[PDB]
Design an enzyme around this catalytic site. Structure first.
Site, mmCIF file in Angstrom:
data_model
loop_
_atom_site.group_PDB
_atom_site.id
_atom_site.type_symbol
_atom_site.label_atom_id
_atom_site.label_comp_id
_atom_site.label_asym_id
_atom_site.label_seq_id
_atom_site.Cartn_x
_atom_site.Cartn_y
_atom_site.Cartn_z
ATOM 1 N N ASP A 1 17.220 -0.280 -13.362
ATOM 2 C CA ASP A 1 17.072 -0.453 -11.921
ATOM 3 C C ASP A 1 17.113 -1.920 -11.524
ATOM 4 O O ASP A 1 16.258 -2.423 -10.790
ATOM 5 C CB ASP A 1 15.791 0.221 -11.411
ATOM 6 C CG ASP A 1 15.794 0.420 -9.893
ATOM 7 O OD1 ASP A 1 16.891 0.436 -9.289
ATOM 8 O OD2 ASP A 1 14.700 0.579 -9.302
ATOM 9 N N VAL B 1 -1.528 -2.636 -3.679
ATOM 10 C CA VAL B 1 -1.366 -3.881 -4.399
ATOM 11 C C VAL B 1 -2.156 -4.996 -3.746
ATOM 12 O O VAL B 1 -2.107 -5.186 -2.526
ATOM 13 C CB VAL B 1 0.106 -4.295 -4.471
ATOM 14 C CG1 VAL B 1 0.244 -5.552 -5.309
ATOM 15 C CG2 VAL B 1 0.926 -3.161 -5.062
ATOM 16 N N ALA C 1 3.296 4.208 -2.138
ATOM 17 C CA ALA C 1 2.921 5.399 -2.891
ATOM 18 C C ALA C 1 2.761 4.991 -4.349
ATOM 19 O O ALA C 1 2.379 5.796 -5.201
ATOM 20 C CB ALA C 1 3.996 6.470 -2.755
ATOM 21 N N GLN D 1 0.833 -1.194 0.000
ATOM 22 C CA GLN D 1 0.000 0.000 0.000
ATOM 23 C C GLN D 1 0.872 1.249 0.000
ATOM 24 O O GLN D 1 0.503 2.273 0.574
ATOM 25 C CB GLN D 1 -0.909 -0.004 1.219
ATOM 26 N N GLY E 1 0.738 2.831 -5.082
ATOM 27 C CA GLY E 1 -0.666 2.476 -5.123
ATOM 28 C C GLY E 1 -0.871 1.263 -4.243
ATOM 29 O O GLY E 1 0.080 0.782 -3.625
#
EC number: 2.7.11.1
Length: 293
Positions: free
Chosen positions: A141, A36, A32, A30, A34
């Protein structure tokens, strides 16, 4: 324009609400990024991972659009499968396959991998990188946290939120987007870096599998970058404990001179990968790390 962004997303997504297509939701993350949730596709049975984001409170919506478009057109066995997307108002839902074996980070922080197991993971990651680089996509990344595992030992790369698409022209990037500890020196020592920054990151990930963490994890990210740029190729704590072929493989991934550093295509041929054990050899580690959470 927030308006143009919504029309762009509207064209990409499947129509309607996903609340019909999926059932037994379960909220996991939960952040930033969103919320999940884990859920079940009611028509295939497939367990999936669904990220719900309220757009008007999402920073860089263009990165989300880029992420979806890149994942949609670059499907590969070694990349977590993007399945679908839906837009309900300013609520965007992105559906990905779900891997129940957690991430490589859980395995390197909770278990001790042997060289055969490390070679297998390195090979699978190189397969994803060769594919992406051959298609002009740089992940940017690469790190254990972005390597997800299946209970059967499948190894898949995820998170294309920071990837770059290059061309003959604009063959090099300069934006600093990766995670400090895994960043290649050239991202900092200069401007213009290419696909090989992912190879460097893979080498740091190999160090994670050997030592439990990337070099300088103990330092402020800001200081780590300076060190990466001024120390160059990292020093192992117990190099004598590694086979000569594994040390050679690491030397090729972590070479300072970009031209000298191995490409994904070149490294897929490395003899270290030939000692790889079957992927199911990873199942006991994955299960152990899942329990030790």
């Amino acid at each position: 324009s927030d308006e143009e962004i919504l029309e762009k997303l509207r064209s990409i997504v499947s129509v309607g609400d996903p609340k019909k297509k999926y059932t037994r939701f379960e909220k996991i993350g939960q952040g930033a990024s969103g919320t999940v949730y884990t859920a079940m596709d009611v028509a295939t049975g497939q367990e999936v991972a669904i990220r719900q984001m309220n757009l008007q409170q999402q920073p860089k919506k263009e990165l989300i659009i880029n992420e979806i478009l890149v994942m949609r057109e670059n499907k590969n066995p070694n990349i977590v499968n993007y399945l679908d997307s839906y837009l309900v108002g300013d609520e965007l839902w992105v559906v990905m396959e779900y891997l129940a074996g957690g991430s490589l980070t859980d395995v390197v922080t909770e278990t001790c991998m042997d060289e055969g197991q490390i070679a297998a993971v390195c090979r699978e990651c190189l397969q994803a990188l060769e594919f992406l680089h051959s298609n002009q996509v740089i992940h940017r990344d690469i790190k254990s946290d972005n390597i997800l595992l299946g209970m059967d030992g499948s190894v898949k790369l995820t998170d294309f939120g920071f990837c770059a698409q290059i061309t003959p022209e604009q063959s090099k990037r300069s934006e600093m987007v990766g995670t400090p500890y895994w960043m290649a020196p050239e991202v900092v020592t200069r401007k213009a870096y290419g696909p090989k920054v992912d190879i460097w990151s893979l080498g740091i990930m190999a160090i994670e599998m050997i030592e439990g963490e990337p070099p300088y994890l103990n330092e402020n990210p800001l200081r780590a970058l300076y060190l990466i740029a001024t120390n160059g190729t990292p020093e192992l704590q117990n190099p004598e404990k590694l086979s000569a072929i594994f040390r050679d493989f690491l030397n090729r991934c972590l070479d300072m001179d970009v031209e000298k550093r191995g490409s994904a295509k070149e490294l897929l041929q490395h003899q270290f990968l030939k000692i790889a054990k079957p992927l199911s050899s990873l199942t006991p580690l994955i299960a152990a790390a899942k329990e030790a959470t």
